[PDB]
Amino acid sequence: REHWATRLGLILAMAGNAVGLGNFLRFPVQAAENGGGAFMIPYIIAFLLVGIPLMWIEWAMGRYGGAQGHGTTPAIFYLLWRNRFAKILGVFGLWIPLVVAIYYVYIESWTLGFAIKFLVGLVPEPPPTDPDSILRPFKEFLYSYIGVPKGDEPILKPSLFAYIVFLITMFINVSILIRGISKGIERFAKIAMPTLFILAVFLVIRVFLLETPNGTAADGLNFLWTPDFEKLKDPGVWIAAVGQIFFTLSLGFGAIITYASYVRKDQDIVLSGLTAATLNEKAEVILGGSISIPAAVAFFGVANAVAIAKAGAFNLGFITLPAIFSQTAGGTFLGFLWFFLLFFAGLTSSIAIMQPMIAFLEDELKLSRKHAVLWTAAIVFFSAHLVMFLNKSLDEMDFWAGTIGVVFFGLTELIIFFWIFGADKAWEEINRGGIIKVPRIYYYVMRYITPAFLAVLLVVWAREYIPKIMEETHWTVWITRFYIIGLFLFLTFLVFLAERRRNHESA
Ligand SMILES: CC(C)C[C@H](N)C(=O)O
Ligand SMILES: [Cl-]
Ligand code: NA
Ligand code: NA
């Protein structure tokens, strides 16, 4: 079995796993729609009670399963709770990251294609003060890229260059992942994380030199870090906070478990996971929240910034920032820098959420690495046509997998590790091999505070919000569900195909 050759390489690979698009695209909108600082207070709180404990549990289950040659949540769940329903619940650890990747690769291909369009200079030409006259050309640019429909049919029709860039993005993912751990993700993280940091800091410095009659870049920072105690009683704020914390730290996708499987049994995971979390957070609030929000605020006031944020998720990342850069000297090169930063971010995160399936095919089906990688590729590439051509088929995938399945699977793996596999035993498993020891106070949070807190949050979530999706939506969403549910069944079948061949090799 392969291993992280360099400790630093392990840390950088886990960072690139965590440091992705949620640090640069999701978090700005998440903070803008939720009163800014009013959203920071839960984000901080839920970072201590949910982020770090689930991080350490992810790492512990990963190292435990990897010591016994299993880097997937079905096998590891069977190794923590010996039952068939354990394997059934572990199937989610392969279903969630796959469904996430199905559209994560598409958005990463968006970033790559936009970087190419900006580098070659094939960009819109905004005529020289009306904000609509500047937000309109880049809006139509994004629409010409992804091919959003125009009439009544919810049928996407992406540009040919977009499909070509998607092919190139999948092929780049394949060329990276075909070289394993110590030769592929490690030597790529060692190169991408410094470049990512450099680009982020350069764009931060460039954004801070922006001033308009609608304010300066400091106003967005103020609104971001100005709390508002009038909103801590809104459960939607806490819902969004814990969801974003699950997302930005890869918590609940089973990918951190997958990388932790390649950790040598004796090497540290406590300080490792804490370091990865701290690096991702420093890349989030210090950098990601200090580029989009300050520019949008300085250019349109907090009111119109929140308006653009509530308009859509890509209004800020794919429209607002390029429209603002088109107003500055060398702004085409600046948008190229921004999109290239996003491309490496999505790259280091997407090569991380596609590893559980290959680990399953290698460890549980005894497939060669090349064939496992190529079949997982073909699966993702084919299934991505459902997201590329069916309108609003990405939102359902992100909801059930990246938004609902994450909290569900986090609670599940928490109850499995501590409440089932053994609170004392799993606590020791976390504290074993660690350079530093896990604080005594997080034992109670892991076993008592985190499950009850997440349970109350999930109760409020399911009681006051979900029934709006299973009714007030277009019928085409079923096409996605009918597929993704049918993608779950498929995986279970392979799980069966695992537990049967294991009864054959021993014979
Ligand atoms: C699913 C994860 C890889 C997401 C990533 N941590 C991000 O913030 O974009
Ligand atoms: Cl295009
Ligand atoms: Na992140
Ligand atoms: Na990443």
Structure determination method: X-ray
What CA–CA distance (Å, rounded) separates 359 from 354? 9
Ligand 1 contact via 315 beta carbon (within 6 Å): no
Is 262 within a domain? Answer: yes
369 is in an annotated binding site: no
Range of the domain at 338: 7-505
CB 62 within 8 A of CB 257: yes
Q: Whose CA is nearest to atom 2 of ligand 1?
A: 250
Residue 193 lies in a domain: yes
**Can you give the length of the chain in residues?**
507
Please report whether residue 322 resides in a domain.
yes
SS3 at position 211: strand
Is the Cβ atom of 91 under 6 angstroms away from ligand 1?
A: no
Q: Which ligand is nearest to the CA of 348?
A: 4
Let me know: does 458 contact 411? Beta carbons within 8 Å.
yes
Span from the CA of 163 to the centroid of ligand 2 (angstroms): 9
CA angle 19, 148, 104 (to 5 degrees): 20
Is residue 170 within a helix (H) or strand (E), and if so which, with residue range?
A: helix 160-177
Contact 4, 355 (CB under 8 A): no
Q: 472 alpha carbon to ligand 1 midpoint, in Å?
A: 29
Tell me which of 104, 108, 349 to substitute to probe ligand 1's pocket, judged by most ligand atoms within 8 Å of the beta carbon: 349
Query: Does 287 reside within a domain?
Result: yes
Q: Give the dihedral sign, CA 55/58/64/68.
A: negative
Q: CA neighbours within 13 Å on the CB side: how many for 279?
A: 21
CB atoms within 10 A of CB 284: 25
Task: Give the Cα separation of 57 and 186 in Å (integer).
Answer: 22
Residues 4 and 182 sit within 8 Å (Cβ to Cβ): yes
Q: CA 473 to CA 471: how far, in whole Å?
A: 6
Residue at 1 is within a domain? no
Non-local (6+) Cβ contacts of 32 within 8 A are 293, 296, 305, 306, 309, 310, 316
Of all protein residues, the one whose alpha carbon is nearest to atom 1 of ligand 1 is: 250
Q: Rounded to an integer, what distance in angstroms lies between the CA atom of residue 17 and that of residue 257?
A: 11
Does the beta carbon of 100 sit less than 6 angstroms from any atom of ligand 1? yes
Decide: 24 and 342 in contact? Cβ < 8 Å. Answer: yes
Is 2 a member of any domain?
no
Q: What is the resolution of this structure in A?
A: 3.8
Give yes or no for a contact between 357 and 71, defined as CB atoms under 8 angstroms apart. Answer: no
In this structure, is residue 264 part of a structural domain?
yes
Encoded amino acid at 180, one letter:
G
354 lines ligand 1 (CB under 6 A): no
Ligand nearest to the CA of 145: 2
Q: What is the rounded distance in angstroms from the CA atom of residue 238 to the CA atom of residue 225?
A: 17
DSSP letter string, 213-235: TTEEHHHHHHHHT---TTSTT-H
Helices 405-417, 235-248: crossing angle, 10 deg rounding: 70
CA 506 distance to own-chain centroid: 39
Q: Which ligand is nearest to the CA of 352?
A: 1
Look up residue 68 and give its DSSP letter.
T
Q: Could you tell me which of 468, 305, 322 has the C-alpha nearest to residue 395?
A: 468
- Own/partner contacts of 379-387, CB < 8 Å, gap of 24 or more, are 379/98, 380/98, 380/101, 380/102, 380/105, 380/170, 380/354, 381/167, 381/170, 383/102, 383/483, 383/487, 384/102, 384/103, 384/105, 384/106, 384/166, 386/102, 386/479, 386/480, 386/483, 387/102, 387/103, 387/106
Cα separation, 393 vs 268, in Å, equals: 40
Alpha helices in 249-291 (DSSP H): 255-261, 270-284
Q: Number of structural domains, the chain?
A: 1
**Can you read off the two tokens belonging to residue 214?**
């609608």
CATH of the domain at 82: 1.20.1740
